[PDB]
CSV table of C-alpha atoms and ligand atoms in Angstrom, one decimal:
chain,number,residue,atom,x,y,z
B,1,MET,CA,115.5,73.3,97.5
B,2,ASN,CA,112.1,74.3,98.6
B,3,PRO,CA,110.3,73.5,101.7
B,4,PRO,CA,106.7,73.0,102.0
B,5,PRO,CA,105.0,76.1,102.0
B,6,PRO,CA,103.1,78.0,105.0
B,7,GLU,CA,99.7,76.1,105.9
B,8,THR,CA,96.5,77.9,104.9
B,9,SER,CA,94.1,75.9,106.9
B,10,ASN,CA,94.5,74.0,110.1
B,11,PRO,CA,91.2,72.3,111.3
B,12,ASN,CA,92.1,72.7,115.2
B,13,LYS,CA,92.6,76.3,114.9
B,14,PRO,CA,89.5,78.4,115.3
B,15,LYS,CA,88.2,80.4,112.5
B,16,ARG,CA,87.0,83.9,112.8
B,17,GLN,CA,85.6,86.5,110.2
B,18,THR,CA,85.8,90.2,111.5
B,19,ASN,CA,85.0,93.4,109.8
B,20,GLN,CA,89.0,94.2,109.9
B,21,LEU,CA,89.8,90.8,108.4
B,22,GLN,CA,87.1,91.5,105.6
B,23,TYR,CA,89.0,94.9,105.0
B,24,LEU,CA,92.2,93.3,105.3
B,25,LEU,CA,91.6,90.8,102.3
B,26,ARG,CA,88.9,93.2,100.2
B,27,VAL,CA,90.9,96.2,100.5
B,28,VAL,CA,94.4,96.0,101.7
B,29,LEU,CA,95.7,93.0,100.3
B,30,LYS,CA,93.6,93.2,97.1
B,31,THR,CA,94.9,96.8,96.4
B,32,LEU,CA,98.6,95.7,97.0
B,33,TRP,CA,98.4,92.7,95.0
B,34,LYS,CA,97.8,95.3,91.7
B,35,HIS,CA,100.8,97.2,92.7
B,36,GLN,CA,103.8,97.1,90.1
B,37,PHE,CA,106.2,95.9,92.6
B,38,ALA,CA,103.7,93.4,93.8
B,39,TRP,CA,104.6,90.1,91.6
B,40,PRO,CA,107.8,88.8,93.6
B,41,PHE,CA,105.3,88.3,96.6
B,42,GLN,CA,102.7,87.0,95.5
B,43,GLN,CA,103.8,83.2,95.9
B,44,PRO,CA,106.7,81.7,98.0
B,45,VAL,CA,110.0,82.5,97.3
B,46,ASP,CA,111.1,79.6,94.8
B,47,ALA,CA,114.7,79.2,95.6
B,48,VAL,CA,115.3,76.5,93.4
B,49,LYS,CA,114.0,78.8,90.2
B,50,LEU,CA,115.7,81.9,91.4
B,51,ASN,CA,118.6,79.7,91.6
B,52,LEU,CA,119.0,80.7,95.8
B,53,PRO,CA,119.7,77.4,97.3
B,54,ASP,CA,120.6,79.3,100.5
B,55,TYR,CA,117.2,81.5,100.8
B,56,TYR,CA,115.7,78.8,103.2
B,57,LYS,CA,118.9,78.3,105.1
B,58,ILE,CA,118.6,81.7,106.1
B,59,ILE,CA,114.7,82.5,106.0
B,60,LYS,CA,113.2,80.0,108.7
B,61,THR,CA,109.7,81.6,108.7
B,62,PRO,CA,108.7,82.3,105.3
B,63,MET,CA,105.7,84.3,104.3
B,64,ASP,CA,103.9,85.5,100.7
B,65,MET,CA,101.0,87.2,100.2
B,66,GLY,CA,99.7,84.1,98.4
B,67,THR,CA,99.8,82.6,101.7
B,68,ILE,CA,98.1,85.5,103.2
B,69,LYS,CA,95.5,85.7,100.7
B,70,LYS,CA,94.5,82.3,101.1
B,71,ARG,CA,94.2,82.4,105.0
B,72,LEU,CA,92.2,85.4,104.6
B,73,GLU,CA,89.7,83.5,102.3
B,74,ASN,CA,90.0,80.4,104.6
B,75,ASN,CA,89.2,82.6,107.5
B,76,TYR,CA,92.2,81.1,109.2
B,77,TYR,CA,93.2,83.8,111.2
B,78,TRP,CA,91.1,85.0,115.0
B,79,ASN,CA,91.9,88.7,114.1
B,80,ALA,CA,93.8,91.2,112.1
B,81,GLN,CA,96.5,91.3,114.3
B,82,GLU,CA,97.5,87.9,113.4
B,83,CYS,CA,97.4,88.7,109.6
B,84,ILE,CA,99.4,91.9,109.8
B,85,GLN,CA,102.1,90.0,111.5
B,86,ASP,CA,102.1,87.9,108.5
B,87,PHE,CA,102.7,90.9,106.5
B,88,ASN,CA,105.5,91.9,108.6
B,89,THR,CA,107.1,88.8,108.7
B,90,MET,CA,107.1,88.6,105.0
B,91,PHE,CA,108.6,92.4,104.9
B,92,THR,CA,111.2,91.5,107.4
B,93,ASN,CA,112.4,88.2,105.8
B,94,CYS,CA,113.1,90.3,102.4
B,95,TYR,CA,115.3,92.8,104.6
B,96,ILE,CA,116.9,90.0,106.2
B,97,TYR,CA,118.3,88.3,103.4
B,98,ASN,CA,119.0,91.1,101.1
B,99,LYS,CA,120.8,94.1,101.6
B,100,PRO,CA,119.5,98.1,101.5
B,101,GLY,CA,119.3,99.4,98.2
B,102,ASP,CA,118.9,95.9,96.3
B,103,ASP,CA,115.8,96.0,93.4
B,104,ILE,CA,113.7,93.4,95.8
B,105,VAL,CA,114.5,95.6,98.6
B,106,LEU,CA,113.0,98.8,97.1
B,107,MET,CA,110.2,96.8,96.0
B,108,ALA,CA,109.3,95.6,99.6
B,109,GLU,CA,109.9,99.1,101.0
B,110,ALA,CA,107.6,100.7,98.5
B,111,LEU,CA,104.7,98.1,99.5
B,112,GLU,CA,105.4,98.3,103.3
B,113,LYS,CA,105.1,101.8,102.6
B,114,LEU,CA,101.4,101.6,101.1
B,115,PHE,CA,100.6,98.5,103.4
B,116,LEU,CA,100.9,100.7,106.4
B,117,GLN,CA,99.1,103.6,104.9
B,118,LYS,CA,96.0,101.4,104.4
B,119,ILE,CA,96.2,99.6,107.9
B,120,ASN,CA,96.3,103.0,109.7
B,121,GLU,CA,92.9,103.2,109.9
B,122,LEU,CA,90.9,100.0,109.7
B,123,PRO,CA,87.0,99.2,110.5
B,124,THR,CA,85.2,99.4,113.7
B,125,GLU,CA,84.0,96.0,114.7
X,201,1A6,C1,113.2,90.5,91.8
X,201,1A6,C2,113.6,89.7,92.6
X,201,1A6,C3,114.8,89.4,93.6
X,201,1A6,C4,115.3,88.4,93.8
X,201,1A6,C5,115.9,87.9,95.2
X,201,1A6,S1,115.4,86.5,96.5
X,201,1A6,C6,114.0,87.4,97.1
X,201,1A6,N1,114.6,87.7,98.6
X,201,1A6,N2,113.3,88.0,99.3
X,201,1A6,C7,112.3,88.0,98.2
X,201,1A6,C8,111.1,88.0,97.9
X,201,1A6,C9,110.4,87.4,97.0
X,201,1A6,C10,111.1,87.0,95.6
X,201,1A6,C11,112.2,87.0,95.8
X,201,1A6,N3,113.0,87.5,97.3
X,201,1A6,O1,114.7,87.3,93.1
X,201,1A6,N4,114.0,88.0,92.3
């Protein structure tokens, strides 16, 4: 069974829009989204459809690019580092639940490499 997905708005949390956050949406997320290995990461893990009822028994801080995209569109984050941490959580969750060599892990590895290439240099404020 599936927990509620992470929040994509929070009215008591202050919003911000920076050149780096705009870039993370327009360039980094939107480019990764098109990768042939992005599809599993475009929405929250559906442990019910995948028939993996232990997924959320192991992963306690779930994240996916669908959530990230909606946060970025909401101006939910204060800075790029906060958003980059949610990408890192998403990749780390994958490596926690799965083992080296697994198809899903090869996909996460590939996207993480592309992610790091793209955030190596960000715009200036
Ligand atoms: C492809 C594929 C891999 C799996 C294994 S479960 C899993 N572990 N991390 C993620 C991330 C997204 C979708 C499924 N995930 O299901 N479909």
